[PDB]
Ligand binder design. Sequence first.
Ligand SMILES: NC(=O)c1ccc[n+]([C@@H]2O[C@H](COP(=O)([O-])OP(=O)(O)OC[C@H]3O[C@@H](n4cnc5c(N)ncnc54)[C@H](O)[C@@H]3O)[C@@H](O)[C@H]2O)c1
Ligand SMILES: NC(=O)c1ccc[n+]([C@@H]2O[C@H](COP(=O)([O-])OP(=O)(O)OC[C@H]3O[C@@H](n4cnc5c(N)ncnc54)[C@H](O)[C@@H]3O)[C@@H](O)[C@H]2O)c1
Ligand SMILES: c1cc2c(cc1Cn1cnc3cc4c(cc31)CCCC4)OCO2
Ligand SMILES: c1cc2c(cc1Cn1cnc3cc4c(cc31)CCCC4)OCO2
Ligand code: NA
Lengths: 259, 259
Amino acid sequence: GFLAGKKILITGLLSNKSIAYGIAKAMHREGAELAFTYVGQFKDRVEKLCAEFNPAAVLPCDVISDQEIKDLFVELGKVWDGLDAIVHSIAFAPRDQLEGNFIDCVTREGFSIAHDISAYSFAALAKEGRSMMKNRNASMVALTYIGAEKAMPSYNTMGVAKASLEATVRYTALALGEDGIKVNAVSAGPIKTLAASGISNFKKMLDYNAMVSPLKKNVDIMEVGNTVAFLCSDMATGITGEVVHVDAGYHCVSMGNVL
Amino acid sequence: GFLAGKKILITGLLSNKSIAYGIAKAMHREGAELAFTYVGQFKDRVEKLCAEFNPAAVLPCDVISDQEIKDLFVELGKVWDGLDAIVHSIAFAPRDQLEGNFIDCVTREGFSIAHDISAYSFAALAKEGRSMMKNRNASMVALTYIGAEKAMPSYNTMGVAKASLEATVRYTALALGEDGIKVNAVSAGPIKTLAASGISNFKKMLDYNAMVSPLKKNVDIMEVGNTVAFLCSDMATGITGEVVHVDAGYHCVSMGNVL
Ligand SMILES: NC(=O)c1ccc[n+]([C@@H]2O[C@H](COP(=O)([O-])OP(=O)(O)OC[C@H]3O[C@@H](n4cnc5c(N)ncnc54)[C@H](O)[C@@H]3O)[C@@H](O)[C@H]2O)c1
Ligand SMILES: NC(=O)c1ccc[n+]([C@@H]2O[C@H](COP(=O)([O-])OP(=O)(O)OC[C@H]3O[C@@H](n4cnc5c(N)ncnc54)[C@H](O)[C@@H]3O)[C@@H](O)[C@H]2O)c1
Ligand SMILES: c1cc2c(cc1Cn1cnc3cc4c(cc31)CCCC4)OCO2
Ligand SMILES: c1cc2c(cc1Cn1cnc3cc4c(cc31)CCCC4)OCO2
Ligand code: NA
């Protein structure tokens, strides 16, 4: 496996639909040793889910909390000497930030929270993980969405937070590259995960994507997972600060034949 | 290997410094079956170079010629039933198009030739290779450079041609995706190959890149090769119309500390 021996922390595993589930399968297949995090209530759920991946640790981490993030690396440092990669697969905005007119729905607090959990959290993991990752061709990868680059209906505050995430990825790439750490993002096409559960006509975004994309299909968690896996391998050591679209080519087309 | 059994055509192999050499090593390591093209004079040189990769064919192809491109796929169809990938690693502009002031140096003919060989040729290969590539998760990959996105000193007409190449990649991605063919480009940082031989002070572009990039190094042909290889695998089936920068992160920074 091209990840044989590498010690990789995966955040955001919540169901077998999670993008993080696909990341896990791909990394496990490629011989990575895996650790996982969960937010408080979901301890048992997550422990069952990642059992199949022989995890070295399954640890709490609510990225709202500086203390929990700090404690995550203290506990992880007890099982591993160094850390090869961090996979960030976490987003949150309050429900009201996510449908209807952007300007009608945006609030100061909703905007704050979405950025806090969706963007700042990446730099926070970077900040606390840094010393374990020093000088071993380490990697970070964040999950992002094209709503960062374009105004889209509904995505609203999450789009703005994603834009802040991608910039964070670039500044993190600049800040960590001297320690040999590469820092990148994967822009996934829409996938029906628990993140989709709030959103009405999500299935419609999905059908639209399959209709307009060059490849005439929807991506799945394995396509995303495989790419994240690649971005954590010695094969990708020349790539940093990059956003790789795994979206069946949605990002490169405008309009199409079916208007 | 993640390319086991895949039949891949590689153009542009000219010395053991060629980016195509790195692509070949990476694909051979991953179990691909390889074929190679050469331009007229270099038959013996190329045959010697790619012998180590146990090539199924080593065939002439000067992309100036529609006939040669057509004959390439006729001959290749005699040894393979289908084709899994085409690697485009070819560029040319007349020497005079490549140093000094863009406007002083650009000529109608030099502009024409650079686009013909550096950009049009990609669609030409696509056009003639299409029927062998139908419905097998096939791949195309072109080599490009950031001079396509930004005005740079010296790169001049090649910059413009690369910009035409990248648009070609996107329209080719749109045109071929219904056949399941993914079409992408790898944007390499500067590498001292025979393409560098005309360019005085190439070593300084190289030193500048290593100073200013997040990773504080120059990419090599294996970093590029490994990425091209990935982009031809079943792991990348969700990626098309994309440009992946393999450039130690050069692309994501502005200014840096050392002015
Ligand atoms: N589903 C899609 O259509 C799609 C498209 C593009 C990008 N993404 C991104 O992929 C990532 C994974 O999302 P998903 O689609 O697998 O959905 P998901 O609901 O399974 O994953 C989101 C994860 O974020 C976690 N999370 C929320 N608040 C957290 C906090 N405070 N601390 C730690 N974790 C927290 C949730 O527990 C969950 O595990 C997100 O960045 C999402 O924006 C998803
Ligand atoms: N070397 C760099 O600094 C760097 C950076 C970014 C992108 N690239 C790109 O990589 C590709 C490979 O170039 P390289 O740098 O390994 O140099 P190279 O000189 O090894 O390869 C260029 C290839 O293009 C071929 N070529 C020229 N005219 C041709 C024609 N008419 N028909 C068929 N082939 C023809 C040459 O024979 C040669 O094999 C090019 O697209 C180049 O622009 C190189
Ligand atoms: C995809 C595309 C969309 C969308 C929702 C999606 C799916 N999606 C992608 N990243 C997400 C991040 C979040 C959510 C959903 C997300 C739910 C709340 C937590 C943050 O709404 C409009 O267009
Ligand atoms: C890189 C950066 C440069 C450059 C040259 C480079 C290196 N390079 C990359 N693609 C190429 C394509 C071509 C040439 C050189 C190429 C020479 C003529 C054939 C086409 O000139 C100014 O800045
Ligand atoms: Na706290």
